[PDB]
Amino acid sequence: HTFFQKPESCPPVPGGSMKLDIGIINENQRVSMSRNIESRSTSPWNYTVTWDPNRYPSEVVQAQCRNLGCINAQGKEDISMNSVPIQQETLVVRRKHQGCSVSFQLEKVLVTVGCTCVTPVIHHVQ
Amino acid sequence: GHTFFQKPESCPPVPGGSMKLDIGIINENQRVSMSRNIESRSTSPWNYTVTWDPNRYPSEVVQAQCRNLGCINAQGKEDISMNSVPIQQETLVVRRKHQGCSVSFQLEKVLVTVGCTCVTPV
Numbered sequence A: 001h002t003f004f005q006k007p008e009s010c011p012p013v014p015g016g017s018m019k020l021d022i023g024i025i026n027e028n029q030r031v032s033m034s035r036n037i038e039s040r041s042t043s044p045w046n047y048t049v050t051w052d053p054n055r056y057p058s059e060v061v062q063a064q065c066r067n068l069g070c071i072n073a074q075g076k077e078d079i080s081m082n083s084v085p086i087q088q089e090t091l092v093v094r095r096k097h098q099g100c101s102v103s104f105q106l107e108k109v110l111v112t113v114g115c116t117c118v119t120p121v122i123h124h125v126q
Numbered sequence B: 001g002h003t004f005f006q007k008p009e010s011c012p013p014v015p016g017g018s019m020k021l022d023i024g025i026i027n028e029n030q031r032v033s034m035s036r037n038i039e040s041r042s043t044s045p046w047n048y049t050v051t052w053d054p055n056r057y058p059s060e061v062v063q064a065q066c067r068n069l070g071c072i073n074a075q076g077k078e079d080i081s082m083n084s085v086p087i088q089q090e091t092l093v094v095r096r097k098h099q100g101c102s103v104s105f106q107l108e109k110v111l112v113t114v115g116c117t118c119v120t121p122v
């Protein structure tokens, strides 16, 4: 069984659709990060704002590491270290149909949120 | 942001004011691609806590905590003149409400610390 499955003893609903209640729980929260984190980082990154009007959130910001290496104390690239992305799974809502027939469906989006500086690994399988 | 979830006023009323949530997760087959042991190989390493809530989808939400205030140098030592700082992302999860046949779902905002980065202090 899955999370969205209603108990088997319950009467069936036409279309197999579920009730989505109004309002987003804890909507008032906002991300709090160090000022200019993406630029002050030794593994700096750039952002790409992706837009979809039939997706909630409509704007999904994607990060991309600026360099292969990490930035040293002198402000130069160090290729002995690697800037690597941090990717996280998220849920967005896809808006379907139109007007009175509007329905919603969950969608999994992989978001690259930022980069970190790692010591490289020599992989056993290339 | 309510408008995305609304219908024109003239639409036939749905008792309970609930919206239609269709079955299935779009692009559920996707898997996170990240460097192996990223959290401990990072110069701003972090710990993970697997938060669990059986009324939440996904039930498991992994939260990161920076292991140090400073960053780790080539020698494996902490340099407290650099800062390990958390990277935070806004996500949506689904909360299950009520019991039995009266079960409904509600969106919920969750702030996720995904890892840490090393920054030069200001």
Ligand SMILES: *[C@@H]1O[C@H](CO)[C@@H](O[C@@H]2O[C@H](CO)[C@@H](O)[C@H](O)[C@H]2NC(C)=O)[C@H](O)[C@H]1NC(C)=O
Pocket (backbone or CB within 6 Å): B047, B065, B066, B067, B068
């Ligand atoms: C990160 O996690 C480690 C555990 O892997 C924590 O280190 C342990 O902390 C507990 C605290 O109860 C101690 O009893 C252990 O002896 C510690 N073990 C090691 C190997 O250090 C550590 O506290 C965590 N770091 C932060 C900053 O939360």
Ligand SMILES: *[C@@H]1O[C@H](CO)[C@@H](O)[C@H](O)[C@H]1NC(C)=O
Pocket (backbone or CB within 6 Å): A039, A045, A046, A066
């Ligand atoms: C982002 O990329 C551009 C090139 O498209 C580059 O000029 C810039 O320095 C990068 N970083 C920031 C913070 O804009």
